[PDB]
Design a protein around this nucleic acid. Structure first.
Ligand code: MG
Ligand code: MG
Ligand code: ZN
Length: 600
DNA sequence: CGGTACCCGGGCATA
DNA sequence: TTGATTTCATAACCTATAGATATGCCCGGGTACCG
RNA sequence: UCCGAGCCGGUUGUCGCGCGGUUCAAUCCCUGGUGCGGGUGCUAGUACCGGCUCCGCACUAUCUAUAGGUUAUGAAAUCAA
């Protein structure tokens, strides 16, 4: 739904200073964490075990049955007919998995509430993974087998006659993907290399829709594509391609957040009979453990604190549930011109990798937010070196790095991964049991939250209390270019909304190749200065980096007789912002986007 | 000392 | 003698998806009652 | 495999400028922010109220898990003996 909000808080403030209640929380979280970790591995183990027959269909009952068997073994006595069949089917494999990993049944009481949350959560991961990444992996497999990486050199670009492969590839993809029915005569033109691809893709047993393409079939029923998706991963390992985790695994040993609701509260925390809870108000139960008077539990926007929290022993996530909720190009500046004209001040931002934000007003005031500032303010860089030092001090790297790949689909290979993981499981848990690992995640949230708040506060001082942000449309929806650090591009579109700041998108086409002072894209030079590589390890290699953020104009109008360089130097980020002001100003004035910056 | 019926709590179902 | 290219493990940052609890009924085991 | 930000110049609205100078500001523990007050604290300018620091209270902040890409660390394989 879309009627919930969360106010994260620390463990100390969330829970009252009661040692008995606090100890149960940590003990309960650890038990649930183990079940979630082993259940995911158990789910994959069952799938791999049956790989030599019809693929087993995975439903909510399948994951739920595994969780109960691990916790209760044979003591689980479901009455649903469907669950009974899965219990017997999964029982031989669950016991076998425990032998490999040495798991011992905790026999936790009142598992149902935790089981249901984990069951849905684990089931969600399968749906999400198949829905989005199924198309990406299948398309990648077609490209890899055709050596599209090497086709760049074999068929050099900038030639018309060499588009045959690209045209050939596009036609084959439609036929292979079954989106378009091929001509029956085309089968005689298949090359031996392409012939194998057609048969291999057919073996995936990809579903079909009589009137819709795969783009809609996957969304309609992602679970139907799960059996094909698992076999697709096997093909990647069969030819050395970069493997992907088709079956999600909760590998991390750090205590994960485990949801604690009203029922779990009396079941395990308060340890009182169900009658004691049924006869007492829901708010009263939580007040005995959690300090509801704190800021985190306060209501907001008509959303009250219905009992639900996820904690990991260092931080607590307090959720607010709206009463009306179930009990259980529109963002571009072009289409929002009427609102922009009413803005007190308009700010244009050109995101980049290093200069994550570079803002400029109509008056020319300059402000920027750099990734280095996040590295210091957020503390991620500090938490990086220190994390490595602890790993080296405890000698976990010597053990952690040798773990066999978990993405393998072969049963024998996966068995080795479990054995190696068990080989040094005891040592690693002691290392990850340190409070620092969970402390860093909570501290990162505070520093990251504090850094974002400071960013908005600084912008308000320079740009006023209320302002409208017109950011460039460029953004990385994942798949960030290699050799470049991660950066926040689409996230800023959400941060402004949380702070009651309107955000709009603008096209950046040709915005970096126009001199604002003469409005001409002809006399512009790019990447003329050179110097040793700024990266210390690349500099030792002797590499030379051509300047990227420096631009200049050779037009006589911009030059002066007293100069010796012969160019009016400009900054890439600042130059882009200046062009945006001209583009935005023209559109606001009714003249539209200038032809200089148009895709003509 | 030896059999029967009512109630409490844990478990499981499913919207 | 020496250094260049692929894959994998553990953290993180963004980025995209989905779900973001509760009431009713079974049963079995402990007890109270009767001879 | 290492870096904070603003400003005065070398600049002309110039560069991961490992160019100079200059001011703050984070180095651990902390959920952040807007405002309407009073007070068990410490700070600078000519008693007034510029700075952090607390409660008490209206509103304002979605997060967990998984996965793709990427970054840091640690490992495996090949080509010339
Ligand atoms: Mg841009
Ligand atoms: Mg830029
Ligand atoms: Zn010019």
């Amino acid at each position: 739904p879309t009627l919930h909000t969360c106010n994260k808080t620390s463990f100390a403030k969330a829970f009252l200073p009661n040692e008995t209640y606090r100890q149960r929380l940590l003990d309960y979280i650890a038990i649930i964490h183990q079940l979630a970790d082993h259940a995911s591995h158990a789910l994959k183990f069952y799938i791999l075990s049956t790989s030599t027959s019809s693929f087993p269909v995975v439903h909510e009952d399948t994951i739920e049955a595994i969780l109960y068997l691990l916790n209760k073994g044979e003591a689980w006595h479901p009455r649903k007919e469907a669950k009974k069949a899965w219990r017997d089917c999964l029982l031989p494999y669950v016991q076998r998995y425990c032998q490999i990993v040495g798991f011992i049944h905790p026999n936790l009481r009142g598992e149902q509430q935790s089981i249901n949350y984990l069951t849905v959560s684990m089931m969600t991961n399968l749906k999400v993974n198949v829905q989005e990444h199924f198309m990406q992996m299948l398309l990648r497999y077609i490209n890899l087998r055709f050596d599209v990486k090497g086709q760049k050199q074999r068929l050099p670009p900038k030639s018309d006659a060499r588009k045959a492969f690209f045209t050939r590839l596009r036609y084959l993809k439609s036929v292979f993907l079954f989106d378009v029915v091929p001509e029956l005569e085309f089968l005689d033109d298949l090359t031996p290399l392409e012939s194998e691809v057609l048969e291999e893709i057919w073996s995936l047993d990809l579903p079909f829709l009589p009137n819709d393409p795969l783009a809609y079939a996957i969304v309609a029923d992602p679970m139907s594509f799960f059996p094909a998706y698992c076999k697709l991963s096997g093909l990647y390992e069969q030819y050395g391609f970069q493997r992907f985790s088709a079956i999600p695994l909760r590998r991390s040993l750090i205590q994960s957040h485990v949801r604690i609701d009203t029922i779990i509260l009396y079941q395990h925390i308060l340890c009182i009979t169900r009658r004691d809870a049924e006869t007492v108000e829901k708010d009263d139960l939580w007040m005995r453990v959690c300090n509801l008077c704190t800021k985190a539990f306060r209501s907001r926007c008509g959303m009250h604190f219905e009992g639900s929290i996820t904690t990991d022993g260092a931080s607590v996530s307090v959720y607010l549930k709206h009463p009306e909720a179930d009990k259980y190009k529109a963002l571009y500046v072009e289409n929002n011109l009427p609102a922009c004209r009413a803005a007190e001040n308009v700010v244009v931002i050109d995101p980049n990798k290093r200069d994550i934000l570079y803002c400029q007003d109509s008056n020319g005031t300059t402000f920027r937010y750099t990734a280095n500032q996040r590295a210091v303010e957020t503390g991620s860089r500090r938490f990086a070196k220190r994390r490595e030092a602890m790993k080296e001090e405890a000698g976990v790297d010597l053990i952690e790095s040798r773990i066999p790949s978990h993405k393998t689909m072969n049963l024998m290979d996966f068995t080795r991964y479990l054995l190696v993981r068990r080989a040094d499981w005891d040592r690693r848990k002691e290392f990850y049991s340190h409070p620092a690992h969970t402390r860093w995640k909570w501290h990162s949230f505070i520093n990251r939250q504090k850094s974002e708040s400071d960013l908005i506060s600084n912008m308000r001082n320079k740009y006023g209390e209320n302002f409208t942000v017109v950011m460039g449309d460029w953004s990385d929806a994942g798949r960030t270019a290699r050799f470049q650090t991660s950066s926040k591009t689409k996230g800023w579109r959400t941060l402004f909304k949380r702070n009651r700041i309107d955000c709009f998108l603008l096209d950046e086409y040709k915005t970096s190749s126009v001199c604002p002072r003469c409005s001409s894209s002809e006399f512009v030079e790019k990447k003329f200065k050179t110097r040793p590589h700024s990266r210390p390890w690349r500099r030792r290699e002797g590499k030379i980096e051509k300047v990227h953020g420096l631009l200049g104009c050779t037009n006589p109008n911009c030059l002066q007789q007293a100069w010796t360089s012969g160019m009016r130097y400009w900054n890439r980020d600042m130059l882009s912002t200046c062009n945006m002001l001209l583009i935005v100003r023209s559109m606001l004035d009714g003249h539209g986007r200038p032809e200089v910056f148009s895709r003509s």
